[PDB]
Amino acid sequence: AEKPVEFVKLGTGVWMHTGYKVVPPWGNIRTNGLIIERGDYSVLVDTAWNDAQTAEIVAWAKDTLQKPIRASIHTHAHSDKMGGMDALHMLGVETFATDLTNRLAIERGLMPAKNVLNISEIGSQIEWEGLTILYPGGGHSEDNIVVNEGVNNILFGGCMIRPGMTTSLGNIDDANLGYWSKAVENAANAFPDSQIVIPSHGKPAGREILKNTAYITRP
Amino acid sequence: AEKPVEFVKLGTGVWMHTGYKVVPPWGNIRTNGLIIERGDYSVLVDTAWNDAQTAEIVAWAKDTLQKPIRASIHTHAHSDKMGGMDALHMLGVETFATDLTNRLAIERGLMPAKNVLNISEIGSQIEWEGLTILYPGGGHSEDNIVVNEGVNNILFGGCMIRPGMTTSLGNIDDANLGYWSKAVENAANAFPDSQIVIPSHGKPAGREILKNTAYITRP
Amino acid sequence: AEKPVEFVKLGTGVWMHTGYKVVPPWGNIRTNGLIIERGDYSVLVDTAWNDAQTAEIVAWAKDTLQKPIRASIHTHAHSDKMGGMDALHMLGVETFATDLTNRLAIERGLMPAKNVLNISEIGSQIEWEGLTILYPGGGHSEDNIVVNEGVNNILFGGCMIRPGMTTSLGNIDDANLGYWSKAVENAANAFPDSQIVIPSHGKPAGREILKNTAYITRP
Ligand SMILES: C[C@H](CS)C(=O)N1CCC[C@H]1C(=O)O
Ligand SMILES: C[C@H](CS)C(=O)N1CCC[C@H]1C(=O)O
Ligand SMILES: C[C@H](CS)C(=O)N1CCC[C@H]1C(=O)O
Ligand SMILES: [Cl-]
Ligand SMILES: [Cl-]
Ligand SMILES: [Cl-]
Ligand SMILES: [Cl-]
Ligand SMILES: [Cl-]
Ligand SMILES: [Cl-]
Ligand SMILES: [Cl-]
Ligand SMILES: [Cl-]
Ligand SMILES: [Cl-]
Ligand SMILES: [Cl-]
Ligand code: NA
Ligand code: NA
Ligand code: NA
Ligand code: NA
Ligand code: NA
Ligand code: NA
Ligand SMILES: [Zn+2]
Ligand SMILES: [Zn+2]
Ligand SMILES: [Zn+2]
Ligand SMILES: [Zn+2]
Ligand SMILES: [Zn+2]
Ligand SMILES: [Zn+2]
């Protein structure tokens, strides 16, 4: 049985959303994203697994925060991050991703974002709705980006950061195994003040999961 | 003189919209689409002939149903189904069509939908806002799709289904004359429980207009 | 120091917005666009220089006119006219430009409009939200369009019309120097009743700045 959606506060105006999917043979697996408050609206980092979970997140921001989701960013073209795009579009959310993420999404039967983030070179950063978005180079995926929230100093690593003290790498079918550890180092060096690090597939932690991920994926 | 727009109830939460256009030499000709209620919003099947008629439909859902139109689907790339796209986009409606419909629309000076429905193979179906959307193969047009509403068992055949007991085929300049009768059979077999069948260019009827259309367009 | 945004009434339901940018070595330079009231909403001609200025314009229409901006048109692919596209998209404004303007925008790192205006041949006109949009041919830029408001007879010339009695042409790096004066003549002949003419980079004036622009850019 699929576990229900969860919301947890990470800092002032910053919330984690978590949805679950049963993936045989191992069963329920979480994916995490963020809701970030922006005055009288909010912005979203990643969908959950599907439209229904994602619609529940939009409703929660509207009805609990009283700060409806205006716009969203997507941290790579897999179904845990873009599985609920149709729900975002029907609910009036303005969606953003890199051109490479959009192209990969279309190829895979995912829906692309409506707007392009112009960050394609390794190390490129842009400011978006008070967040710093960084392309650290290919790692978990060639298109993975990370998102830093500088008020609370929360770094969203998404699926590029592995959970806990695992030594498993997750699904690596389209990973950049050669560059992933450098990409982690690039993110860690870009955002040195962030002591809260969020992976997609585990619990919120500290910078030890940057160090551990870089070690377990290093050549 | 162009006859005005009309709304008629077909079943619980399902409404037909009808707009008219004077087309010489024969004069006024109707086109039909649907409004389908979805909780506290509604969804739209097809525009009417133009922006003004389509804006009237959007206003009617907002002000009479108190269920504003959130999203729409378009059943092929002709001006009776996509003539009012600009009005939908300006009124905040999130529009959906197949990739082939969008490509044909652009070619013809029509505006494409914002989102792609991923149904391109003959017989492919998807669920969309509680509706079943089917691509039955080429018939009236290569891109024609049909839409089934399973609560009331209403099958929207659009222009692929001819009205009444006519033997005329309408404009066949880009019809698939070889496959059209099979496409009708495919729709009839896919939705056997639907005893209400809606053509674009005639009155609501029963399954006899599926049988008649398949006969008059058969090789 | 960058001067703040300004709003001035030009006629019934027609407002000019003006934003400033410090461009060394000459300093602050204005750019002008329009807000045009449309019943219980408004439409926008051009962004200002950036997202922040453009968001201020959207808020002004919402809170002062009580006629929120529903849609916008963009008169060529430079940053004074499309520098605030991301703000328009996040604020729910439905954006329009020609296909050529969108293609040039993407090339230049600007964000394209969501919808295409189908005017690509010299002299083509379309009606859009009660306005007449004309492509007069290449002048300041190959893609420049002009916008006429026929109730007050206000012609928005954008950057194709130079300010005042200047003899400077502005930045001409991608101008059509051969056709620009004819393009001005084309606009003047298309909208003979407009005695208010708005350039992007100077004060509102009369038809003397059409005549002066045509003279100073003539072969
Ligand atoms: C569909 C996701 C995209 S990152 C995936 O590949 N999974 C599912 C959860 C983690 C990882 C895995 O295979 O271990
Ligand atoms: C413009 C429409 C698109 S199905 C059309 O071709 N018409 C107009 C109404 C019916 C049919 C015909 O020519 O008979
Ligand atoms: C960025 C704008 C686009 S029309 C520009 O080229 N400018 C800046 C203001 C006028 C003109 C100039 O160089 O003089
Ligand atoms: Cl779902
Ligand atoms: Cl995936
Ligand atoms: Cl963990
Ligand atoms: Cl119209
Ligand atoms: Cl047509
Ligand atoms: Cl869009
Ligand atoms: Cl009939
Ligand atoms: Cl800005
Ligand atoms: Cl520019
Ligand atoms: Cl001046
Ligand atoms: Na989805
Ligand atoms: Na900080
Ligand atoms: Na239209
Ligand atoms: Na049923
Ligand atoms: Na901008
Ligand atoms: Na007039
Ligand atoms: Zn992934
Ligand atoms: Zn993942
Ligand atoms: Zn048709
Ligand atoms: Zn038709
Ligand atoms: Zn310019
Ligand atoms: Zn300019």
List keywords for this structure.
hydrolase; alpha/beta; Metallo-beta-lactamase, Chain A; binds zinc ion; binds L-captopril; homotrimer; Structural Genomics; binds chloride ion; seven-stranded mixed beta sheet; binds sodium ion; 219 residues
Query: Biggest interface, which chains?
Result: A-B, 7 and 9 residues
Number of helices of chain A: 6
**Helix-strand pattern of chain A:** EEEEHEHHEHEEEEEHEH
Strand order of the largest sheet of chain A: 1-2-3-4-5-6-7
DSSP strand (E) fraction of chain A?
25-35%
Chemical compounds bound to the protein: L-captopril, chloride ion, sodium ion, zinc ion
Please state the oligomeric state of the protein chains shown: homotrimer
User: What percentage of residues of chain A falls in helices of 4 or more residues?
Assistant: 10-25%
Describe this entry's structure for a reader.
The structure is a homotrimer of 219-residue chains. By secondary structure, the first copy, chain A, is of the alpha/beta class. Chain A contains 6 helices and 12 strands. Chain A has one domain (1-219): Ribonuclease Z/Hydroxyacylglutathione hydrolase-like (Metallo-beta-lactamase, Chain A, 4-Layer Sandwich), CATH 3.60.15. Helix content of chain A is 25%, strand content 30%. The relative contact order of chain A is 0.14. Chain A binds chain C through residues 70-71, 92, 94, 114-116, 118, 129, and chain C through 86, 89-90, 92, 109, 111, 114. The structure holds L-captopril (X8Z) (3 copies), chloride ion (10 copies), sodium ion (6 copies) and zinc ion (ZN) (6 copies). The site of one chloride ion has 2 residues of chain C, from loops. It is classed as hydrolase. Keywords: hydrolase, Structural Genomics, Center for Structural Genomics of Infectious Diseases, csgid. The assembly is trimeric. The entry is titled "Crystal Structure of Metallo Beta Lactamase from Hirschia baltica in the Complex with the Inhibitor Captopril".
